[PDB]
Nucleic acid binder design. Sequence first.
DNA 1: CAGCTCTGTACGTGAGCAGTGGA
DNA 2: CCACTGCTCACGTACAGAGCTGT
Lengths: 181, 172
Amino acid sequence: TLPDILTFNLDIVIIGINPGLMAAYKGHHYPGPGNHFWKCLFMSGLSEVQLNHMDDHTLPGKYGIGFTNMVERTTPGSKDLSSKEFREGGRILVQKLQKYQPRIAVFNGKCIYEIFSKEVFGVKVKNLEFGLQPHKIPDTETLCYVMPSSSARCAQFPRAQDKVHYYIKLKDLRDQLKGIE
Amino acid sequence: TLPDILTFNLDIVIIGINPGLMAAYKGHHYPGPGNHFWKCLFMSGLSEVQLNHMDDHTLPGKYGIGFTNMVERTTPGSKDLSSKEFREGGRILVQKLQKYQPRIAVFNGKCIYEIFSKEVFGVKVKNLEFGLQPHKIPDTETLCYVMPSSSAKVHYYIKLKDLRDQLKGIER
DNA sequence: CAGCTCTGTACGTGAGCAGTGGA
DNA sequence: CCACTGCTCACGTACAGAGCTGT
């Protein structure tokens, strides 16, 4: 229902659990609010102006940020996705990453990665911490970074100011690598 | 898109504006469980056990309650709507009411009615209060009852029940 | 006991909204 | 004509409360 906005040689690709009802209707990646995503991006410095879901297709290629989503179907969401739903979901994800070889995969939401590690790596992870996870996407030099959901539904991060921090860190990792070159 | 759920011999027909995302996605009417509507229904004796949104196809059955909305095009908000879609919205609605002929049309907001008026009867209705309104549906004996939103009262539900009981009662 | 799959909740913020009562 | 209370929602995620566990 909600397409991918991937190109080759992306620095960052943002992975979302699934598209919300609002995103399904609206057709563009991260509308809301509550979605910090757009605000955080501008706040973090990842974009120098504030933009919004209407600009989602400009992001690879102005910014080299592509969107995609672990599960393409729309739910409310998110509590309603089966446990098997993601499993067949993430598999497709890997293949995408493999093809596209972005520098960094950014997992918007710990629930995503928590199942991802379990099923793609085969590791139940202890007490996950946001930020960089050790591993690479298997046939590629693409690094996984985990970040709390943009969705305002998670309580522990009340505001865009609360999650901006990860976005700043992500930018750092980006121009670390880009820089070494 | 969301169905109408209407039967010929209905007492109450419940009329929203457009369906919303949740309603359209679930395929059923007033789905919550943060919608008061099902609670209100049960509390005020209209149902006698607490139903839930999926049970909306059985309400014309034993309860005589049908659902509709003024504009069937789905949308998050009202704000998303040209008046033109309402204008066309209104005519269509009226037709079905004329056709199905329920005792009472119940307006799910003051808002819907507020514009139903100027579309249909071409007036503004000054310092509107809830409850039974004076006019009937054009060319019909169907009444208009406006009660407050389900989204926020239980009293008016009971009133509506009673009014229904009166209407039933006169004919008998 | 910590250690650990289960469910299973009760979490803060803001846009949005229905209704009311004001510059 | 717009400023009010209070109320669901939103691409979740953190912690008590069960029923199991080992040198």
